[PDB]
Design a protein around this ligand. Sequence first.
Ligand SMILES: Nc1ncnc2c1ncn2[C@@H]1O[C@H](COP(=O)(O)OP(=O)(O)OP(O)(O)=S)[C@@H](O)[C@H]1O
Ligand SMILES: [Mg+2]
Lengths: 419, 187
Amino acid sequence: MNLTELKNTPVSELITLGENMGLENLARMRKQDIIFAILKQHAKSGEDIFGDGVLEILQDGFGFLRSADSSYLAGPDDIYVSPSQIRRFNLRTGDTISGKIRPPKEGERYFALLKVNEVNFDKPENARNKILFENLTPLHANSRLRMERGNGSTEDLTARVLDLASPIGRGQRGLIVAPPKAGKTMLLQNIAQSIAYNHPDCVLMVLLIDERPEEVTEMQRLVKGEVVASTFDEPASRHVQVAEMVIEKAKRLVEHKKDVIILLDSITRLARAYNTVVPASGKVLTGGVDANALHRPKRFFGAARNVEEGGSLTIIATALIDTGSKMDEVIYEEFKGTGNMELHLSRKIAEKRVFPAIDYNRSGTRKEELLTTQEELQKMWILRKIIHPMGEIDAMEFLINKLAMTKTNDDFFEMMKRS
Amino acid sequence: TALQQAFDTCQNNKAAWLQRKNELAAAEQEYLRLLSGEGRNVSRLDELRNIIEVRKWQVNQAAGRYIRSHEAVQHISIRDRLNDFMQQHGTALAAALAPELMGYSELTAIARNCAIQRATDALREALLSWLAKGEKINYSAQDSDILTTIGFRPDVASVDDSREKFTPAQNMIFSRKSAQLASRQSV
Ligand SMILES: Nc1ncnc2c1ncn2[C@@H]1O[C@H](COP(=O)(O)OP(=O)(O)OP(O)(O)=S)[C@@H](O)[C@H]1O
Ligand SMILES: [Mg+2]
């Protein structure tokens, strides 16, 4: 009765299976309640199964275990993690644990864990000795990331545009500044499915906070990689705890020399959520924001780096622009200069609906020499010198027109050099 | 062996295109009947208009793919007929084309190209003279039935329905709309 197949299948399958062996009417409980129940009665027959999840530690020494598909929401599906497990298997937050579970005994109301058999998709025994985060040394983004397919669709054209505008490498720190209706949705899509179709080896995650339910539900069926989100319906405490849990799990994953890429939406919303949840420090600056509120998102965004011995944590994030709220530019100015590169978008470009609305001139990168070769970098500065004279939007139509008929940017290079 | 697979691809594409046209015609007649009816349900009118748009886009796509399949079939047949005709009469062609075809292997790229164009317009003039002679042309015996079934040119309904051109963004949004519409209609 593994929760994986009881959770991925729709609620109709769950209620059908519940009616198969005779639970009380299932059309009144919640997904977490339904799975907790059905697993309890189906496990009372006498057999045992595996169990997968991610563990966190609350204020007390006792710990809980959550599931990824449940959007990191606490509930009856949570599995106990006794502190004895923390000592005997050096367990910490954010580790993916798979092992034998225990049915809820009398006096206990959540699920229990018996034995551990797979910690961070690896044997727990050989993972006892591990290098922790504090002694890791960062490195410049060296491995170039590919987001181009060459098929030639509008999504492919946008991917080529963003590839040529600024390089993206493994273990970098990037920002995507864009006001609303600038196409942030299908851009973030473009990155997601492009790196999914180009780099299946590295795991893909997308965290989303306070978006509309339709956007997140069309996210769940668009990206092949797992996506975690919490809309604006939940309070800010849910958002901040989801963000901290997922970022610490990503840090634990990259500690295993595994490449991880993060699509972050949005730094402004995160900062607002922490400001609402953090106690006041007595020093409030312009916009109703105190100093300690932005300190958590500072290290949240600063966790991106390239690991020396192996693995790379790349983080690309978006920020709200000129929305009319005075704290947005406060977080804007606070987060400027802390990223390896930034990509700018404008409104006047999208008024004429020139997609994407990226700003080539404002776009830039730090230390391009190490990330790419000199030949392609020079084949980039030539476009830079071509694009500086005329306007940004005119350069947009120029580039999309003279890149549309060309299958790939590589062929585009020789097609334009002769001109 | 590609001749038979191309022929069946073309015929099933034509059948699917016929399916698309009669589905679109049924949708159009239903929409017209509901417009003429006393019923004033605006939601039905809007959803039928969406049906009409999706069906006409599907008909255009079917016509385009049928045309491209027909062109591919014709190209394959022409290539095969040219191949076996030249395998039969290569010496006969080369005897006439010798004055500007000697030493093709040792000729440089530009000389090869100029000789190619000289033979090209020479045979162009020869074909013009043959057409001026005016004898009716018959299909090859080996590939008679397939070409007769396919025909020299596709149906006019295929070519007049492809007049409108759709940008890739419109094509992709139409694809999503058709997918969701079919998913909802199946249920
Ligand atoms: N590459 C693209 N291909 C097709 N449509 C695009 C493309 N880029 C933008 N659009 C259109 O741009 C419009 C607005 O895009 P959105 O993603 O909704 O804007 P946004 O930046 O995400 O901000 P929001 O979601 O409105 S708050 C939609 O109608 C899209 O169809
Ligand atoms: Mg959006």
